[PDB]
Design a binder for this molecule. Structure first.
Ligand SMILES: O=C(O)[C@H]1O[C@@H](O)[C@H](O)[C@@H](O)[C@@H]1O[C@H]1O[C@H](COS(=O)(=O)O)[C@@H](O[C@@H]2O[C@H](C(=O)O)[C@@H](O[C@H]3O[C@H](COS(=O)(=O)O)[C@@H](O[C@@H]4O[C@H](C(=O)O)[C@@H](O[C@H]5O[C@H](COS(=O)(=O)O)[C@@H](O)[C@H](O)[C@H]5NS(=O)(=O)O)[C@H](O)[C@H]4O)[C@H](O)[C@H]3NS(=O)(=O)O)[C@H](O)[C@H]2O)[C@H](O)[C@H]1NS(=O)(=O)O
Ligand SMILES: Nc1ncnc2c1ncn2[C@@H]1O[C@H](COP(=O)(O)O)[C@@H](OP(=O)(O)O)[C@H]1O
Length: 371
Protein backbone atom coordinates (compact mmCIF):
# COMPACT_ATOMS: atom_id res chain seq x y z
CA UNK A 1 0.00 0.00 0.00
CA UNK A 2 3.04 2.29 0.08
CA UNK A 3 2.89 5.33 -2.20
CA UNK A 4 6.50 6.49 -1.59
CA UNK A 5 9.11 5.52 -4.15
CA UNK A 6 12.19 4.00 -2.51
CA UNK A 7 15.21 5.27 -4.46
CA UNK A 8 18.76 4.09 -4.99
CA UNK A 9 21.75 5.63 -6.75
CA UNK A 10 21.14 3.23 -9.64
CA UNK A 11 17.43 4.08 -9.95
CA UNK A 12 17.60 7.85 -9.33
CA UNK A 13 17.96 8.83 -13.01
CA UNK A 14 14.99 6.84 -14.33
CA UNK A 15 12.68 7.53 -11.37
CA UNK A 16 13.44 11.27 -10.87
CA UNK A 17 15.31 12.86 -13.76
CA UNK A 18 13.25 10.99 -16.40
CA UNK A 19 9.90 11.28 -14.55
CA UNK A 20 7.11 13.52 -15.80
CA UNK A 21 5.88 16.28 -13.52
CA UNK A 22 6.71 17.04 -9.90
CA UNK A 23 8.63 14.82 -7.47
CA UNK A 24 9.61 15.65 -3.87
CA UNK A 25 12.78 13.84 -2.73
CA UNK A 26 13.55 13.39 0.98
CA UNK A 27 17.24 12.79 1.73
CA UNK A 28 17.40 10.95 5.06
CA UNK A 29 19.36 8.50 7.21
CA UNK A 30 18.70 6.25 10.19
CA UNK A 31 20.89 8.40 12.50
CA UNK A 32 18.95 11.62 11.72
CA UNK A 33 16.47 12.45 14.46
CA UNK A 34 14.44 15.14 12.66
CA UNK A 35 14.27 12.86 9.61
CA UNK A 36 12.42 10.33 11.77
CA UNK A 37 10.01 12.94 13.14
CA UNK A 38 9.12 14.23 9.66
CA UNK A 39 8.71 10.74 8.10
CA UNK A 40 4.98 10.33 8.96
CA UNK A 41 4.25 13.85 7.69
CA UNK A 42 5.49 12.80 4.24
CA UNK A 43 3.08 9.83 4.34
CA UNK A 44 0.14 12.21 4.88
CA UNK A 45 1.38 14.54 2.13
CA UNK A 46 1.74 11.67 -0.36
CA UNK A 47 -1.99 10.90 0.00
CA UNK A 48 -3.24 14.50 0.09
CA UNK A 49 -1.22 15.47 -3.03
CA UNK A 50 -1.96 12.40 -5.18
CA UNK A 51 -2.17 13.45 -8.82
CA UNK A 52 0.09 16.52 -8.44
CA UNK A 53 3.11 15.13 -6.58
CA UNK A 54 4.96 11.87 -6.07
CA UNK A 55 7.04 11.43 -2.91
CA UNK A 56 10.34 9.57 -2.88
CA UNK A 57 13.15 8.85 -0.43
CA UNK A 58 16.85 8.19 -0.85
CA UNK A 59 18.75 6.81 2.13
CA UNK A 60 22.10 8.58 1.88
CA UNK A 61 23.98 6.03 4.00
CA UNK A 62 23.02 3.16 1.70
CA UNK A 63 23.22 5.26 -1.50
CA UNK A 64 25.98 7.83 -0.88
CA UNK A 65 26.58 8.97 -4.47
CA UNK A 66 23.59 11.19 -5.22
CA UNK A 67 23.54 13.81 -2.44
CA UNK A 68 27.03 15.28 -3.16
CA UNK A 69 25.93 16.00 -6.76
CA UNK A 70 23.32 18.44 -5.33
CA UNK A 71 25.57 20.03 -2.69
CA UNK A 72 23.57 18.56 0.17
CA UNK A 73 25.48 19.14 3.41
CA UNK A 74 22.69 18.62 5.97
CA UNK A 75 19.64 16.41 6.32
CA UNK A 76 16.65 16.29 6.09
CA UNK A 77 16.72 17.99 2.71
CA UNK A 78 13.64 18.26 0.52
CA UNK A 79 14.34 18.76 -3.21
CA UNK A 80 11.41 19.38 -5.56
CA UNK A 81 12.30 18.34 -9.12
CA UNK A 82 10.30 19.15 -12.25
CA UNK A 83 11.28 17.48 -15.57
CA UNK A 84 14.80 16.67 -14.44
CA UNK A 85 15.76 20.08 -13.02
CA UNK A 86 15.77 21.24 -9.42
CA UNK A 87 12.79 23.58 -8.89
CA UNK A 88 12.91 24.38 -5.17
CA UNK A 89 14.60 23.37 -1.94
CA UNK A 90 13.87 23.44 1.75
CA UNK A 91 16.50 22.89 4.44
CA UNK A 92 15.77 21.50 7.90
CA UNK A 93 12.89 20.06 9.88
CA UNK A 94 9.56 21.74 9.16
CA UNK A 95 5.91 21.37 10.13
CA UNK A 96 3.02 20.31 7.91
CA UNK A 97 1.92 23.92 7.45
CA UNK A 98 5.36 25.04 6.31
CA UNK A 99 5.63 22.09 3.93
CA UNK A 100 2.17 22.68 2.46
CA UNK A 101 3.00 26.37 2.21
CA UNK A 102 6.26 25.40 0.49
CA UNK A 103 4.59 22.98 -1.93
CA UNK A 104 1.62 25.22 -2.75
CA UNK A 105 4.07 28.08 -3.45
CA UNK A 106 6.16 25.84 -5.78
CA UNK A 107 3.69 23.70 -7.79
CA UNK A 108 1.62 24.91 -10.72
CA UNK A 109 -1.36 22.65 -10.12
CA UNK A 110 -4.03 24.57 -12.00
CA UNK A 111 -6.96 22.15 -11.74
CA UNK A 112 -8.19 22.19 -15.34
CA UNK A 113 -10.59 20.38 -17.68
CA UNK A 114 -8.41 18.70 -20.33
CA UNK A 115 -9.33 16.84 -23.48
CA UNK A 116 -8.79 13.07 -23.23
CA UNK A 117 -5.37 11.78 -24.21
CA UNK A 118 -6.62 8.15 -24.32
CA UNK A 119 -10.07 6.88 -25.38
CA UNK A 120 -11.62 3.45 -24.79
CA UNK A 121 -13.43 3.12 -28.13
CA UNK A 122 -14.82 -0.41 -27.71
CA UNK A 123 -15.92 -3.00 -27.83
CA UNK A 124 -19.32 -2.95 -26.17
CA UNK A 125 -19.68 -5.82 -23.64
CA UNK A 126 -15.93 -6.48 -23.61
CA UNK A 127 -15.43 -4.87 -20.16
CA UNK A 128 -15.18 -1.21 -21.16
CA UNK A 129 -16.59 0.06 -17.86
CA UNK A 130 -14.41 -2.32 -15.84
CA UNK A 131 -11.29 -1.28 -17.76
CA UNK A 132 -12.06 2.39 -17.16
CA UNK A 133 -12.70 1.78 -13.45
CA UNK A 134 -9.42 -0.13 -13.07
CA UNK A 135 -7.36 2.47 -14.94
CA UNK A 136 -8.70 5.11 -12.51
CA UNK A 137 -6.67 3.40 -9.77
CA UNK A 138 -3.53 4.97 -11.22
CA UNK A 139 -2.94 8.37 -9.46
CA UNK A 140 -2.35 10.11 -12.80
CA UNK A 141 -5.49 8.79 -14.51
CA UNK A 142 -8.80 10.67 -14.29
CA UNK A 143 -11.88 9.10 -15.88
CA UNK A 144 -14.90 10.58 -17.60
CA UNK A 145 -17.46 8.68 -15.54
CA UNK A 146 -20.29 8.94 -18.11
CA UNK A 147 -20.33 8.11 -21.80
CA UNK A 148 -20.38 11.48 -23.54
CA UNK A 149 -21.28 10.28 -27.09
CA UNK A 150 -19.64 13.19 -28.94
CA UNK A 151 -18.17 11.82 -32.18
CA UNK A 152 -21.08 9.38 -32.75
CA UNK A 153 -23.81 12.06 -32.43
CA UNK A 154 -24.09 14.72 -35.14
CA UNK A 155 -26.08 16.91 -32.73
CA UNK A 156 -23.38 16.89 -30.03
CA UNK A 157 -20.48 16.98 -32.51
CA UNK A 158 -21.84 20.27 -33.90
CA UNK A 159 -21.35 22.02 -30.54
CA UNK A 160 -17.58 21.96 -31.19
CA UNK A 161 -14.52 20.49 -29.50
CA UNK A 162 -14.70 23.08 -26.71
CA UNK A 163 -18.11 21.75 -25.66
CA UNK A 164 -16.50 18.31 -25.42
CA UNK A 165 -13.60 19.62 -23.28
CA UNK A 166 -16.00 21.26 -20.82
CA UNK A 167 -17.81 17.90 -20.44
CA UNK A 168 -14.57 16.28 -19.08
CA UNK A 169 -13.71 16.11 -15.37
CA UNK A 170 -11.30 18.40 -13.59
CA UNK A 171 -7.71 17.18 -13.40
CA UNK A 172 -4.19 18.51 -12.83
CA UNK A 173 -1.92 19.47 -15.79
CA UNK A 174 0.20 16.35 -15.26
CA UNK A 175 -2.85 14.01 -15.29
CA UNK A 176 -4.19 11.98 -18.20
CA UNK A 177 -7.93 11.89 -18.95
CA UNK A 178 -9.61 8.70 -20.29
CA UNK A 179 -13.08 8.51 -21.92
CA UNK A 180 -15.13 5.33 -22.53
CA UNK A 181 -17.58 5.22 -25.47
CA UNK A 182 -18.17 1.69 -26.92
CA UNK A 183 -20.31 2.93 -29.84
CA UNK A 184 -17.29 4.73 -31.35
CA UNK A 185 -15.90 1.35 -32.51
CA UNK A 186 -18.87 0.67 -34.85
CA UNK A 187 -20.02 4.15 -35.90
CA UNK A 188 -18.65 4.43 -39.44
CA UNK A 189 -18.00 8.21 -39.31
CA UNK A 190 -15.95 8.47 -36.08
CA UNK A 191 -12.26 7.81 -36.99
CA UNK A 192 -12.05 10.98 -39.09
CA UNK A 193 -13.48 13.15 -36.31
CA UNK A 194 -11.10 11.81 -33.67
CA UNK A 195 -8.18 11.98 -36.13
CA UNK A 196 -8.93 15.63 -36.88
CA UNK A 197 -9.15 16.63 -33.21
CA UNK A 198 -5.88 14.88 -32.30
CA UNK A 199 -4.11 12.62 -34.77
CA UNK A 200 -1.67 11.39 -32.06
CA UNK A 201 -4.36 10.34 -29.56
CA UNK A 202 -4.04 6.88 -28.02
CA UNK A 203 -6.91 4.41 -28.54
CA UNK A 204 -7.88 1.50 -26.28
CA UNK A 205 -9.84 -1.55 -27.50
CA UNK A 206 -11.16 -4.19 -25.07
CA UNK A 207 -12.34 -7.52 -26.50
CA UNK A 208 -13.40 -10.95 -25.31
CA UNK A 209 -14.32 -14.20 -27.15
CA UNK A 210 -16.45 -13.09 -30.17
CA UNK A 211 -19.27 -15.59 -29.65
CA UNK A 212 -19.36 -14.92 -25.91
CA UNK A 213 -19.53 -11.14 -26.49
CA UNK A 214 -22.50 -11.61 -28.82
CA UNK A 215 -24.36 -13.60 -26.18
CA UNK A 216 -23.57 -10.91 -23.62
CA UNK A 217 -24.87 -8.31 -26.06
CA UNK A 218 -28.07 -10.29 -26.70
CA UNK A 219 -28.66 -10.69 -22.96
CA UNK A 220 -28.56 -6.91 -22.43
CA UNK A 221 -30.98 -6.22 -25.29
CA UNK A 222 -33.21 -8.99 -23.95
CA UNK A 223 -33.17 -7.55 -20.43
CA UNK A 224 -34.02 -4.16 -21.90
CA UNK A 225 -37.09 -5.59 -23.62
CA UNK A 226 -38.19 -7.76 -20.69
CA UNK A 227 -37.90 -4.70 -18.44
CA UNK A 228 -40.42 -2.85 -20.64
CA UNK A 229 -42.66 -5.97 -20.82
CA UNK A 230 -41.95 -6.71 -24.48
CA UNK A 231 -41.22 -9.75 -26.65
CA UNK A 232 -37.94 -10.90 -28.18
CA UNK A 233 -36.57 -13.86 -30.07
CA UNK A 234 -34.16 -16.55 -28.96
CA UNK A 235 -30.47 -15.93 -29.60
CA UNK A 236 -30.40 -18.82 -32.10
CA UNK A 237 -33.28 -17.45 -34.21
CA UNK A 238 -31.36 -14.14 -34.55
CA UNK A 239 -27.80 -15.44 -35.01
CA UNK A 240 -28.70 -18.15 -37.57
CA UNK A 241 -30.46 -17.53 -40.86
CA UNK A 242 -33.59 -19.77 -40.85
CA UNK A 243 -33.37 -20.61 -44.58
CA UNK A 244 -29.67 -21.34 -45.22
CA UNK A 245 -29.04 -22.49 -41.59
CA UNK A 246 -25.83 -20.40 -41.64
CA UNK A 247 -24.66 -17.48 -39.52
CA UNK A 248 -26.86 -14.39 -40.04
CA UNK A 249 -24.33 -11.70 -40.96
CA UNK A 250 -27.10 -9.05 -40.72
CA UNK A 251 -27.42 -9.43 -36.92
CA UNK A 252 -25.62 -6.48 -35.27
CA UNK A 253 -24.46 -8.63 -32.32
CA UNK A 254 -22.53 -10.75 -34.82
CA UNK A 255 -21.25 -7.82 -36.90
CA UNK A 256 -20.00 -6.06 -33.78
CA UNK A 257 -18.02 -9.19 -32.86
CA UNK A 258 -16.13 -9.09 -36.20
CA UNK A 259 -13.48 -6.94 -34.52
CA UNK A 260 -11.17 -6.99 -37.55
CA UNK A 261 -13.79 -5.46 -39.89
CA UNK A 262 -14.07 -2.39 -37.69
CA UNK A 263 -10.32 -2.11 -36.99
CA UNK A 264 -9.61 -1.81 -40.74
CA UNK A 265 -11.69 1.38 -40.85
CA UNK A 266 -9.79 2.91 -37.93
CA UNK A 267 -6.46 1.90 -39.46
CA UNK A 268 -7.19 4.15 -42.46
CA UNK A 269 -6.52 7.13 -40.15
CA UNK A 270 -4.38 5.85 -37.25
CA UNK A 271 -1.30 3.57 -37.23
CA UNK A 272 -1.61 0.32 -35.30
CA UNK A 273 1.13 1.64 -32.97
CA UNK A 274 -1.41 4.10 -31.51
CA UNK A 275 -3.76 1.23 -30.54
CA UNK A 276 -3.50 -1.18 -27.64
CA UNK A 277 -5.75 -4.23 -27.49
CA UNK A 278 -6.73 -5.32 -23.97
CA UNK A 279 -7.65 -9.00 -23.53
CA UNK A 280 -11.06 -8.89 -21.85
CA UNK A 281 -10.98 -12.60 -21.08
CA UNK A 282 -7.74 -12.17 -19.13
CA UNK A 283 -9.06 -8.98 -17.55
CA UNK A 284 -11.68 -11.16 -15.84
CA UNK A 285 -9.35 -13.97 -14.65
CA UNK A 286 -6.07 -12.09 -14.02
CA UNK A 287 -6.39 -8.30 -14.53
CA UNK A 288 -2.99 -6.94 -13.32
CA UNK A 289 -0.85 -8.21 -16.27
CA UNK A 290 -3.25 -6.64 -18.77
CA UNK A 291 -3.46 -3.42 -16.74
CA UNK A 292 0.32 -3.25 -16.46
CA UNK A 293 0.56 -3.29 -20.26
CA UNK A 294 -1.90 -0.38 -20.48
CA UNK A 295 0.28 1.55 -18.02
CA UNK A 296 3.28 1.23 -20.30
CA UNK A 297 1.15 2.04 -23.34
CA UNK A 298 0.16 5.32 -21.66
CA UNK A 299 3.77 6.12 -20.59
CA UNK A 300 2.66 5.92 -16.94
CA UNK A 301 4.90 4.59 -14.14
CA UNK A 302 3.98 1.22 -12.55
CA UNK A 303 1.58 2.15 -9.73
CA UNK A 304 -1.35 -0.30 -9.92
CA UNK A 305 -0.53 -3.27 -7.65
CA UNK A 306 -2.04 -6.60 -6.64
CA UNK A 307 -3.27 -4.94 -3.44
CA UNK A 308 -5.68 -2.82 -5.52
CA UNK A 309 -7.53 -5.90 -6.88
CA UNK A 310 -9.16 -8.64 -4.80
CA UNK A 311 -11.29 -11.60 -5.83
CA UNK A 312 -14.90 -11.50 -4.63
CA UNK A 313 -16.05 -15.13 -4.65
CA UNK A 314 -19.60 -13.88 -3.99
CA UNK A 315 -19.95 -11.60 -7.03
CA UNK A 316 -17.75 -13.94 -9.10
CA UNK A 317 -15.55 -11.11 -10.45
CA UNK A 318 -12.74 -8.90 -9.20
CA UNK A 319 -13.49 -5.70 -7.27
CA UNK A 320 -11.41 -2.58 -6.74
CA UNK A 321 -9.58 -1.69 -3.51
CA UNK A 322 -8.38 1.92 -3.39
CA UNK A 323 -7.36 2.84 0.17
CA UNK A 324 -8.03 1.01 3.47
CA UNK A 325 -11.73 2.02 3.63
CA UNK A 326 -12.83 2.65 0.01
CA UNK A 327 -13.97 -0.48 -1.87
CA UNK A 328 -15.94 -0.50 -5.12
CA UNK A 329 -17.49 -3.35 -7.11
CA UNK A 330 -19.20 -2.97 -10.48
CA UNK A 331 -22.98 -2.57 -10.89
CA UNK A 332 -25.50 -5.39 -11.30
CA UNK A 333 -25.65 -5.00 -15.09
CA UNK A 334 -22.02 -6.25 -15.10
CA UNK A 335 -22.09 -10.05 -14.84
CA UNK A 336 -25.38 -11.23 -16.33
CA UNK A 337 -26.60 -14.81 -16.14
CA UNK A 338 -26.17 -15.82 -19.77
CA UNK A 339 -28.76 -18.07 -21.46
CA UNK A 340 -27.84 -21.57 -22.54
CA UNK A 341 -27.35 -21.66 -26.31
CA UNK A 342 -27.47 -24.87 -28.34
CA UNK A 343 -23.85 -26.24 -28.47
CA UNK A 344 -24.36 -26.78 -32.20
CA UNK A 345 -25.01 -23.08 -32.84
CA UNK A 346 -22.04 -22.05 -30.68
CA UNK A 347 -19.83 -24.33 -32.78
CA UNK A 348 -21.02 -22.74 -36.02
CA UNK A 349 -20.41 -19.23 -34.65
CA UNK A 350 -16.91 -20.18 -33.43
CA UNK A 351 -15.95 -21.52 -36.86
CA UNK A 352 -17.38 -18.42 -38.54
CA UNK A 353 -15.28 -16.02 -36.44
CA UNK A 354 -12.07 -18.17 -36.63
CA UNK A 355 -10.70 -16.59 -39.86
CA UNK A 356 -11.61 -13.12 -38.62
CA UNK A 357 -9.92 -13.89 -35.30
CA UNK A 358 -6.70 -15.03 -36.99
CA UNK A 359 -6.60 -11.83 -39.04
CA UNK A 360 -7.15 -9.80 -35.87
CA UNK A 361 -4.19 -11.46 -34.17
CA UNK A 362 -2.00 -10.82 -37.21
CA UNK A 363 -2.94 -7.12 -37.52
CA UNK A 364 -2.83 -6.30 -33.81
CA UNK A 365 0.07 -8.58 -32.91
CA UNK A 366 -1.75 -10.06 -29.88
CA UNK A 367 -2.82 -13.69 -30.08
CA UNK A 368 -5.82 -14.15 -27.79
CA UNK A 369 -6.27 -17.92 -28.33
CA UNK A 370 -9.98 -17.91 -29.11
CA UNK A 371 -11.72 -21.18 -30.08
O1 LIG B 1 -33.83 -2.67 -31.62
C1 LIG B 1 -34.94 -2.11 -31.71
O2 LIG B 1 -36.02 -2.75 -31.62
C2 LIG B 1 -34.99 -0.62 -31.94
O3 LIG B 1 -35.68 -0.56 -33.20
C3 LIG B 1 -35.85 0.77 -33.65
O4 LIG B 1 -36.30 0.76 -35.01
C4 LIG B 1 -36.86 1.47 -32.77
O5 LIG B 1 -37.16 2.77 -33.26
C5 LIG B 1 -36.26 1.54 -31.38
O6 LIG B 1 -37.23 2.08 -30.47
C6 LIG B 1 -35.77 0.18 -30.86
O7 LIG B 1 -34.93 0.41 -29.70
C7 LIG B 1 -34.30 -0.69 -29.01
O8 LIG B 1 -33.05 -0.99 -29.64
C8 LIG B 1 -32.17 0.13 -29.67
C9 LIG B 1 -30.95 -0.21 -30.52
O9 LIG B 1 -30.16 -1.22 -29.91
S1 LIG B 1 -28.92 -1.74 -30.64
O10 LIG B 1 -29.33 -2.47 -31.81
O11 LIG B 1 -28.17 -2.60 -29.77
O12 LIG B 1 -28.10 -0.63 -31.04
C10 LIG B 1 -31.81 0.52 -28.23
O13 LIG B 1 -30.95 1.67 -28.21
C11 LIG B 1 -29.61 1.31 -27.80
O14 LIG B 1 -29.57 0.71 -26.50
C12 LIG B 1 -28.24 0.31 -26.14
C13 LIG B 1 -28.30 -0.47 -24.86
O15 LIG B 1 -27.24 -1.00 -24.45
O16 LIG B 1 -29.39 -0.58 -24.27
C14 LIG B 1 -27.35 1.55 -26.01
O17 LIG B 1 -26.01 1.15 -25.67
C15 LIG B 1 -25.18 2.17 -25.04
O18 LIG B 1 -25.81 2.83 -23.93
C16 LIG B 1 -26.19 1.98 -22.85
C17 LIG B 1 -27.00 2.83 -21.88
O19 LIG B 1 -26.15 3.83 -21.32
S2 LIG B 1 -26.70 4.85 -20.32
O20 LIG B 1 -28.05 5.20 -20.68
O21 LIG B 1 -26.70 4.28 -19.00
O22 LIG B 1 -25.88 6.03 -20.34
C18 LIG B 1 -24.95 1.34 -22.23
O23 LIG B 1 -25.30 0.40 -21.21
C19 LIG B 1 -25.08 0.92 -19.87
O24 LIG B 1 -23.71 1.21 -19.60
C20 LIG B 1 -23.55 1.94 -18.38
C21 LIG B 1 -22.09 2.25 -18.21
O25 LIG B 1 -21.72 3.44 -18.31
O26 LIG B 1 -21.29 1.32 -17.98
C22 LIG B 1 -24.08 1.11 -17.20
O27 LIG B 1 -24.18 1.96 -16.03
C23 LIG B 1 -23.97 1.27 -14.77
O28 LIG B 1 -22.70 1.57 -14.19
C24 LIG B 1 -22.47 2.93 -13.82
C25 LIG B 1 -21.08 3.00 -13.18
O29 LIG B 1 -21.00 2.01 -12.15
S3 LIG B 1 -19.66 1.33 -11.83
O30 LIG B 1 -18.61 2.30 -11.92
O31 LIG B 1 -19.43 0.25 -12.75
O32 LIG B 1 -19.71 0.80 -10.49
C26 LIG B 1 -23.54 3.43 -12.85
O33 LIG B 1 -23.40 4.84 -12.63
C27 LIG B 1 -24.94 3.14 -13.39
O34 LIG B 1 -25.91 3.47 -12.39
C28 LIG B 1 -25.05 1.67 -13.76
N1 LIG B 1 -26.37 1.38 -14.28
S4 LIG B 1 -27.38 0.46 -13.44
O35 LIG B 1 -28.54 0.16 -14.24
O36 LIG B 1 -27.78 1.14 -12.25
O37 LIG B 1 -26.71 -0.77 -13.09
C29 LIG B 1 -25.45 0.46 -17.47
O38 LIG B 1 -25.70 -0.58 -16.53
C30 LIG B 1 -25.56 -0.13 -18.87
O39 LIG B 1 -26.91 -0.50 -19.15
C31 LIG B 1 -24.16 0.61 -23.32
O40 LIG B 1 -22.91 0.15 -22.79
C32 LIG B 1 -23.90 1.50 -24.53
N2 LIG B 1 -23.25 0.72 -25.57
S5 LIG B 1 -22.92 1.35 -27.01
O41 LIG B 1 -24.12 1.53 -27.77
O42 LIG B 1 -22.04 0.48 -27.73
O43 LIG B 1 -22.28 2.63 -26.81
C33 LIG B 1 -27.35 2.31 -27.34
O44 LIG B 1 -26.66 3.56 -27.26
C34 LIG B 1 -28.78 2.60 -27.78
O45 LIG B 1 -28.77 3.18 -29.10
C35 LIG B 1 -33.08 0.84 -27.45
O46 LIG B 1 -32.77 1.12 -26.08
C36 LIG B 1 -34.05 -0.33 -27.55
N3 LIG B 1 -35.30 -0.03 -26.88
S6 LIG B 1 -36.16 -1.20 -26.21
O47 LIG B 1 -35.30 -2.05 -25.43
O48 LIG B 1 -37.16 -0.64 -25.35
O49 LIG B 1 -36.78 -1.98 -27.24
N1 LIG C 1 -14.57 -6.91 -12.40
C1 LIG C 1 -15.66 -7.11 -13.16
N2 LIG C 1 -16.88 -7.11 -12.59
C2 LIG C 1 -17.96 -7.33 -13.38
N3 LIG C 1 -18.01 -7.56 -14.71
C3 LIG C 1 -16.77 -7.55 -15.26
C4 LIG C 1 -15.59 -7.34 -14.54
N4 LIG C 1 -14.48 -7.39 -15.37
C5 LIG C 1 -14.97 -7.62 -16.55
N5 LIG C 1 -16.32 -7.72 -16.57
C6 LIG C 1 -17.14 -8.01 -17.79
O1 LIG C 1 -17.45 -6.90 -18.63
C7 LIG C 1 -18.73 -7.13 -19.30
C8 LIG C 1 -19.45 -5.84 -19.63
O2 LIG C 1 -18.67 -5.00 -20.47
P1 LIG C 1 -19.18 -3.52 -20.91
O3 LIG C 1 -19.05 -2.67 -19.67
O4 LIG C 1 -18.29 -3.05 -22.04
O5 LIG C 1 -20.63 -3.66 -21.33
C9 LIG C 1 -19.49 -8.06 -18.38
O6 LIG C 1 -20.41 -8.76 -19.20
P2 LIG C 1 -21.49 -9.91 -18.75
O7 LIG C 1 -22.61 -9.14 -18.09
O8 LIG C 1 -21.87 -10.62 -20.02
O9 LIG C 1 -20.71 -10.83 -17.83
C10 LIG C 1 -18.38 -8.92 -17.73
O10 LIG C 1 -18.13 -10.15 -18.41
Amino acid sequence: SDKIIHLTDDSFDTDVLKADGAILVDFWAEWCGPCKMIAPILDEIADEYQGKLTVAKLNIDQNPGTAPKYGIRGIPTLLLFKNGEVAATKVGALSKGQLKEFLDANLAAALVQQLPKAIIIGVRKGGTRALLEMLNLHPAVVKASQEIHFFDNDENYGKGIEWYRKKMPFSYPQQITIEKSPAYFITEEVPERIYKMNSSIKLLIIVREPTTRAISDYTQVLEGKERKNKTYYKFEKLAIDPNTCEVNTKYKAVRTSIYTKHLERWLKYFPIEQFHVVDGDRLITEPLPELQLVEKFLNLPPRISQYNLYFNATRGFYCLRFNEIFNKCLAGSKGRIHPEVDPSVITKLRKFFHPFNQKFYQITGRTLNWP
